[PDB]
Amino acid sequence: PQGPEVALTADILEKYFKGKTLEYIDFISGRYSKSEPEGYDDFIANLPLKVSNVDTKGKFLWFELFDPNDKSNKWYIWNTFGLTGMWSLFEAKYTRAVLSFDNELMAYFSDMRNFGTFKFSNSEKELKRKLNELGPDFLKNDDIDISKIKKYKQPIVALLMDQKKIGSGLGNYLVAEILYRAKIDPHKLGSNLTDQEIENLWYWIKYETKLAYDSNHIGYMVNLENESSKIGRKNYHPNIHPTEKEFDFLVYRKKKDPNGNKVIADKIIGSGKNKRTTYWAPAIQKLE
DNA sequence: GTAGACGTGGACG
DNA sequence: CGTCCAGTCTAC
Domain residue ranges of chain A, discontinuous segments joined by +? 1-136, 137-288
What is the rounded distance in angstroms from the CA atom of residue A16 to the CA atom of residue A1?
20
Residue with minimal CA–C1' distance to B3 is: A272
Phi/psi for A280 (5° steps) reads: -150, 160
Total number of residues shown for chain A: 288
Protein residue nearest nucleotide C7, by CA to C1' = A82
Nearest to A212 by CA among A180, A275, A268, A170: A170
CA distance A79 to A5: 14
Instruction: Return the C-alpha torsion angle A159, A162, A164, A168, nearest 10.
Output: 110
Q: Whole-angstrom Cα distance, residue A31 to residue A16?
A: 27
Is A275 within 7 A of strand C by CB distance? no
CA–CA gap between residue A34 and residue A29 (Å, rounded): 8
Nucleotide nearest to A31 (CA to C1'): B7
Which nucleotide shows the minimum CA-to-C1' distance to residue A273? B4
Å from the A93 CA to the B7 C1': 14
Beta-bridge partners for A278:
A266
Q: How many angstroms separate the CA atoms of A252 and A237, rounded? A: 24
Rounded to 10°, the helix A3-17/A195-213 angle is: 40
| CA neighbor of A2 nearest in space, from A174, A202, A206 | A174
Q: Is A277 (CB) below 7 Å from strand C? A: yes
Kindly give, in sequence order, each residue whose CB lies less than 8 Å from that of residue A17, ignoring residues fewer than 6 positions away.
Answer: A51, A54, A101, A105, A107
Element (H, E) at A23: strand A21-27
> Class of A1-136 per CATH?
alpha beta
Alpha helices in A39-171 (DSSP H): 40-44, 124-131, 156-161
Cα gap A233→A59, rounded to integer Å: 18
Query: What is the side-by-side strand order in the sheet with A21-27?
Result: A85-88, A106-111, A95-101, A21-27, A49-57, A60-67, A70-80, A117-121
Experimental technique: X-ray
The C1' atom of C7 and the CA atom of A245 lie apart, in whole Å, by: 27
Helix-strand-coil split of chain A, %, nearest 5: 30, 25, 45
Task: Give the residue from A171, A143, A178 showing the smallest Cα distance to A58.
Answer: A171
Task: Please choose, from the candidates A249, A220, A181, the residue with its C-alpha nearest in 3D space to the C-alpha of residue A94.
Answer: A220
- Strand B nucleotides, any atom under 7 Å from protein beta carbons: they are 1-9
CATH 1.10.8.50 at A137-288, yes or no: yes
Nucleotide nearest to A272 (CA to C1'): B3
Using the CB atom, is residue A3 less than 7 Å from strand C? no
Whether the beta carbon of A79 falls within 7 A of nucleic chain C: the reply is no
CA dist A218 and A215 (Å) reads: 6
Q: Which residues contact A50 (CB under 8 A, 6 or more apart)?
A: A19, A20, A21, A22, A65, A66, A67, A68
A274 touches strand C (CB under 7 A): yes
- Verify if strand C has an atom below 7 Å from the CB of A129: no
Distances (CA, A) of A184 to A23, A73, A137, A197, A211: 50, 49, 22, 8, 19
**Cβ-contact A170, A206 below 8 angstroms:** no
Q: Is the CB of A82 under 7 A from strand C?
A: yes
Count of helices and strands (H, E) across chain A: 8, 10
The answer to whether residues A214 and A233 touch, using CB atoms and an 8 Å cutoff, is: yes
CA pair distance A202, A250, nearest whole angstrom: 19
Positions of strand C less than 7 angstroms from a protein CB = 5-10
Q: Which of A5, A6, A55, A3 is nearest to A167 (CA)?
A: A3
State how far the alpha carbon of A71 is from the alpha carbons of A14, A51, A66, A187, A234, in Å.
19, 11, 6, 51, 28
Closest alpha carbon to A139 in A81, A187, A178, A84: A178
- DSSP labels, A209-267: HHHHHT-S--SGGGGGHHHHTTS-----STT---S-SS---SSTT-SB-TTSPBPEEE-
Nucleotide nearest to A94 (CA to C1'): B8
Task: Say if residues A35 and A255 touch (Cβ distance below 8 Å).
Answer: no
Q: Residue A267: which nucleotide is closest by CA–C1'?
A: C5
Nearest nucleotide to A115 (CA to C1') is B6
